[PDB]
Amino acid sequence: QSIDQLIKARGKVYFGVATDQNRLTTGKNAAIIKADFGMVWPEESMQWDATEPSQGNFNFAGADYLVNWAQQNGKLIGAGCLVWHNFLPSWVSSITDKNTLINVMKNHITTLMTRYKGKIRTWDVVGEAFNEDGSLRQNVFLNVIGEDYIPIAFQTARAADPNAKLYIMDYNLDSASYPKTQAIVNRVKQWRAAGVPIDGIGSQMHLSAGQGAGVLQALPLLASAGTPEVSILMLDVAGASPTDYVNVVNACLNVQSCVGITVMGVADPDSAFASSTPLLFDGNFNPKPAYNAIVQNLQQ
Template identity: 40%
Template sequence: MKKIIALLGILTLTVSCKTASTATSDLTLKNAFKNKFYIGTAMSLPQIYEKDVKSVEIIKNQFSSIIAENCMKSMFLQPEEGKFFFDDADKFVAFGEKNKMFIIGHTLIWHSQLPKWFFVDKDGKDVSAEVLKQRMKNHITTVVSRYKGRVKGWDVVNEAIMEDGTYRKSKFYEILGEEFIPLAFQYAQEADPNAELYYNDYNEWHPGKVKTVSKMVQTLKSRGIRIDGVGMQTHVGLDTPSIAEYEKAILDYAANGVKVNVTEMEISALPSPWGTSANVSDKVEYEAKMNPYTAGLPENVKAEWENRYLDFFRLFIKHQDKIRRVTLWGTTDAQSWKNDFPVKGRTDYPLLFDRNNQAKPVVEKIIQLTKEK
C-alpha cells in the first residue's frame, strides 16, 4: 500500500511539473499573438550566424517573424555592379526556414545604405532614366528571384515621402520622378508573384505623409500593380505620436485595402534633441543631457515607458484585423541602434529584453493583454 501511495505521489509530482513546464512555455509572445498577427524582430549578423547564443534563443522562443537589420540592403548585397554577395542573406533566410518563421526582406529600393555606383556612370555623372531603370530591375529581379517562395514579404521601397507629403528629393526621384515607385513594385511582383509587397516609412502618422502614401497605394492598385501593405516604422519616444494620431493612420491606410505592418518598433525613454526624426543621416553632437540614464531608467521613467508599450499593444490588438505583423527593431537593449543615435555614446533601453537577455516585466503584461476580452 505504501508503495502504491509513493508511486501516486511521484506520478502527481510528474504531472504537475509537466503542467508547470507547459504553462511556462506558453507564455511567449509568438504563442500569445498566434491567432492575431506575426510578432517579429530584426536580426543582426551575430544572431544570424548564431554567435550571440542567448539572444538567438530569445528569437527562436519568442518571435514568429524575422527581418534582416542590415544584410539585405543594397550596399551589402551588390557592392559592385553585377557582383552580388549573398552569404549573409542566405544564412538569414536559412535561419528563418529552419525555425518556421515568416521571413521579411529589407529593403530593395532605398536612397540610403546604397552602393555609390548605383546612380552614376564611369565619369561620375548621373545615369540616364533608362540606365537607372535597368539597374533597379536587375537588382530587384536578382534578389527577389533568388529567394522566391522563401522570403514571404519585401519592403520594396523605403522612406520615399517626407512628412509634409512631398517626395524625398533622392536620386531615384531626381532621375525617374514618382515613377520609380511603381517600377520597383512592378519588378518585384514579376520576380515573385506570390510574395507580399510593402511600402515602408517612418513618421507615417503625419497627415501629409498619410495622404501621399494613400494616393500612392491607390495609384498602384489602379494600374494593376500589387501592394499588400504599408509599413509604419515605429521608432517612437514617450510623447510623440499620440495613440490617437497613430490609430488614425492605421485606419486611413487600411481604408485603401492594404494591411498595416508595424515595423522597426522600439520606444526610447531618452530625450530627443530634434523632435521625432528617425532619419539615419540626422546626427547631433554628444551632450551629457542627452544621455541621462547611463545606470538604468529611474522607476518613474520605467513605468512611463512600460505604459507606453502597453498602450501601443492595446491599439494593435484592437485593430488586429488590419495588422499583418508587429516587428521590434532588435531583440535586446544591447543590440539596439538607439544606443548611438542620434547621439554617439548614448545608453538607451528601448526593447523588450534587457542587456542580460532577460525579458522585462512588460513582456508578460503584453502577453496578458492578449487574454483580455
C-alpha cells in the first residue's frame, strides 16, 4: 500500500522523501519511490556547495537529474536550501562587505529558482536561522547583512518564481514549551505582518525516541504563526517505533495547514544515522512495522 495515496485520500497533498541521483540509480530506491511516495527532495544536489562551488560558476547536473526523474514519474518536487550555514562554500562565508554579500545571495537565489521556474512546488529558502534560546543564529548572513537577510531572501525568492511556496525551516521545534519553537512563531508572525512572503514553516523532525508524542502539541503551535502551510521535513525516528511514527502522522492530520510529510530517506543503511535504524524500510528494502502502522492508521 502507498502511504502517499492514502494520505492524499485523507485530504493531504503528499507523502515525500529525500533522495538524489546516487540513490535513484542503485538498489530498489527508485521502485519504492515510484510506488509509495508522491514528492521528492534532493538531499544534497541543490545545496550551495553543489550548485555554486565557485561564484557565478553553477553546476546543475545532479539537480537536473532529480527534476527530470520527478517529472517523468509524476512526482511533486521540493528543493532547498537556498540560504543557511550548512553546505556553504568558504568563498561565501569569507565575504565581509554587506552590498557584496546581498548581491551574491540574491544571485544564488534567483539563478536556482529561475532555472526550475514553475516546476518546484516548495522551496526551503532559509534554514536553521535560530539558536536554541530563540535568538538568531550568527551565520555569515547575520554577521554581515544583519537580520534583514531573511526578509531580503524571501522577497527575492518570491520575485523569481511566484508559483512556488516559500518556507523557513528549523530543527528542535518539537516541543511546545521549548524557547526555539515559540521564538520562530513570534518572528514569522511579525515578518508576515510586514508583508514578507513566508508561505510555510518546515519542521526538521530528526527525532529521538518518544518525541512523537510532543509533536501533537508543537505542530499546532507552529500553525498558529499563520503561515499558509506547515510541513514536516527530514523525518526520521531513532528506533523507528510505530508509536512515534503514528503520532507524527496524527499531528499532521490534526493540523489543517500541514500539507504533508517528508522522510529523510528510504532504507536504514543509507541513513546518516543508520545504526539507530530510524527509517521506514530495512536494509533488505522491506517495509518495517512502522510503515505498516502508518498504512493501517490512514486506512482507518
